[PDB]
Structures are given as structure tokens and as C-alpha cells.
Amino acid sequence: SDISTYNGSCVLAMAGDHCVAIASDRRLGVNMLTVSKDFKRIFQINDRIYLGLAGLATDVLTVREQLRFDVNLLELREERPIDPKKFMNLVKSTLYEKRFSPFFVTPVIAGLLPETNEPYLAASDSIGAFAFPKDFAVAGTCEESLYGICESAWRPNMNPDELFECTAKCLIAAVERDSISGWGGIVYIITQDKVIIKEIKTRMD
């Protein structure tokens, strides 16, 4: 049918009280067939930046490696970690350089601002049309489901526990309505001090 639908993906990011939460389904599916339940769609890009690539597994790995190439080169040439906004623009540049042969992945950058520690969500389409939702950034084949659940469920100023609570529950609700998405979830709660990587249980069907 569609190339994006080939690898079912469901990436969510939510903004809390000086904390972000990026969750993702753990399924590597090939159209309607589940190949794996240990597929990593969220990648740590920086100490306070995580990138979830919701889309074609091929382009998830290609974009992740290309942005690890760009971020590593930037941090070597600048002796400084990349900012969440700098990395957002980097991802936008990476996707628009292939604008006319686009990567079939929508990135979701969940980061904390380097100094203020404020949440920073930045979700783009296949070609880097980045949005900067102060509440939640969704991507993948569960896009409509995630939008619907997070619009009602997300509330401002969620602490890391509450932020994890909706990230997990809201992602579970999204994946359980997407056939090609689910098979376990992983939620990275990024805070000022620690990153909490909680593997949550979703439906395995």
C-alpha cells in the first residue's frame, strides 16, 4: 500500500515540569507481519536530547546514523554538546536535503533546554516541517490515535511521574488502536538529573 505503512511505528513525546518524555512502540513489523519486539526507534542524540524516528526502519536507522554523524562532527568541531534547537534545525536540514527523495521517517526530538531545563518537543514530517508543540509531539502510523489521546490526556506541568503516566498510558491507547504498532513500549523520561528508561507493557497483538 504505502511505504511509510511498511514499518509500523508509534513515537510520542510529551512536555512536563522541566522534563520531557519520549515513548515509542517496540515493534519492527513488515506490513502486517511482526518481525521483532526489540526495535529501537528512540535514540539518545545528546545527554539532554532524545530522537524518536517514527517511520520506515530503513530510514530510521539511516537518519539516526546520519544525525549521529552530523552531531558527532559538530561536537568534535565545537567541543560542545548540540542544543535541542540546534539539533532540531540539523534534523530539518538533513530531511530537506533529501526533500525530493524523502526519508520515510517523522522525527520527534524530545530534549531539555541546556540552561533553563525547559521541555523542548520538536516533531517534523518526512521532510523536516518541524512543529514545536509545548504539549505533545506525535508521529508514526498511530499519528491520529496519538493526537486524539494526547489532546485530552496531556495536562500542563506534569512532574516526571505524571509525565511518564500519560506518556505510557496515552502511547498504549494509541498503539492498541494501530494494528501495525505496539508489541511493547519504551518511555524515556528526560529530567534535569536523570534519564529514566521504563519499558512499559502494551498489547502484543
Binding site: 559538530l74 568541531r77 565545537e78 560542545r80 534547537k85 540546534k86 534545525n89 540539523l90 536540514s93
Partner: protein, 229 residues
């Protein structure tokens, strides 16, 4: 076919073309740079060809981006080419990353371009040394970029005409605790030391990065205000 390198190591390991470009810098007009606590300054004795020259049309102190600024000593046209390249690199950095190219990134790009021209064939090294000021995370920064493409980082330095005397003057009359106004005064005094006759605000261009971390060229009124004191 001129693709051979005209900058080559001499019998003793001395790039004669690099030394020649450095001499061109040494006869290219004195420009001073002073790093204060809360900013940095780059001034230059931009004495025009004649009183008929319009200063604004060939300002030696120029903007690379909102946060980075550059002065030079040497071949004016080489500086203009490097300045266009640095501004283009900064706007490319903004396109790819949404922020002005960092000060040390601008310095490294200028250094890379100059080294490239010292290695590729059919070209001579750029006969300019660039004093690039801008803010890094730990504070203001002044950077010398030589024709070789080697870039020093300085608290203060002059690298133009009579730059040895001016660098001794800076060694003798520089202190870290200087403010941006103190740094501008130090740069103007250094220019006075290495300039024959009375110095005038018309004849020097000053560009400063301050607490705002934005590079701004001082208008002739501000330069005169500094000179009078």
C-alpha cells in the same frame, strides 16, 4: 596546468609563500584586538587612500554574523573574499543549525579556507591576518587567523604595520580586568602608538562584542567620543 602548489616547504621547512603572505600582512595596515572581561574589541587604522574616499564603502571592520566580527591586516581584496566566504559559511550554518556560526567555528572556517589556499595549486595564500571577535560559552574571544591558516587565540594583539611595537605596547599596557570601554581605549591607544601624526576617529574603525554578545561596529560619533576621553 598550474595545479602545482606555489606554497612549498623550503630547504629548512619554511613555507616561503607563507612568510611572504605574513610580510604582506605586516605591511597591510595596523589592526588591534583587545579581549575584555565582558566583551572583545577589534579596531584598525583605516586611513583612506585620500580624504576623497568614502569610508563606509570599504570598512575594514566588518560583520560575519550577529555575534561574530572581523578586522584584518593585509591585502584588502583577500580580506573581502575571506569575509564573503565567512559570511556565507555563517548563513549556511544558520540554515543547517538555526544559529549564527560560533566564533571559534567562524575562526576555524577562515583558517580552513586559508590553509586550503596555502595547499591547493595555482593560488597564493591569502595575504591577510584576521582578528575575529565573538562570544563563546566561557566568555568573549579574540582570534588571530594567519595566512597559513593557523589561528591563535589572543587576549590582545596587533598584527599590521609596526605590529611588533604595538604587541609590545599591548604586553605592557593590557590587563584582563579591563571592561569593553577600557578595551576600546586600549585599542585606540595601541593604534595611536603605531600611527604617525594625530589619530582621528575618521581614520580608525572599531567593532565590539559586548555583554549582549552581538557584534556592532562603532559609528564615527562613538569612536570620537572614545578618543576625546
Amino acid at each position: 596546468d598550474s595545479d602545482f602548489s606555489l606554497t612549498t616547504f623550503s630547504s629548512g621547512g619554511k613555507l616561503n609563500q607563507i612568510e611572504s603572505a605574513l610580510k604582506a600582512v605586516s605591511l597591510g595596515g595596523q589592526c588591534v584586538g583587545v579581549k575584555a572581561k565582558n566583551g572583545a574589541v577589534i579596531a584598525c587604522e583605516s586611513k583612506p587612500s585620500s580624504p576623497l574616499v568614502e569610508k563606509v564603502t570599504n570598512l575594514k571592520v566588518q560583520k560575519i554574523n550577529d555575534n561574530v566580527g572581523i578586522v584584518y591586516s593585509g591585502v584588502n581584496t583577500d580580506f573581502h573574499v575571506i569575509l564573503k566566504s565567512l559570511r556565507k559559511a555563517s548563513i549556511k550554518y544558520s540554515l543547517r543549525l538555526g544559529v549564527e556560526m560560533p566564533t571559534r567555528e567562524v575562526v576555524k572556517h577562515a583558517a580552513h579556507k586559508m590553509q586550503y589556499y596555502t595547499q591547493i595549486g595555482g593560488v597564493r595564500p591569502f595575504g591577510v591576518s584576521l582578528l575575529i571577535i565573538g562570544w563563546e560559552e566561557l566568555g568573549p574571544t579574540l582570534w588571530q587567523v594567519d595566512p597559513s591558516g593557523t589561528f591563535w587565540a589572543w587576549k590582545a594583539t596587533a598584527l599590521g604595520k609596526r605590529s611588533d611595537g604595538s604587541r609590545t605596547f599591548l604586553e605592557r599596557r593590557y590587563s584582563e580586568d579591563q571592561s569593553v570601554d577600557d578595551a576600546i581605549h586600549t585599542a585606540i591607544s595601541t593604534l595611536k602608538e603605531g600611527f604617525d601624526g594625530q589619530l582621528t576617529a575618521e581614520l580608525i574603525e572599531i567593532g565590539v562584542v559586548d555583554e549582549t554578545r552581538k557584534f556592532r561596529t562603532l559609528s564615527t560619533a562613538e569612536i570620537r567620543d572614545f578618543l576625546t576621553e
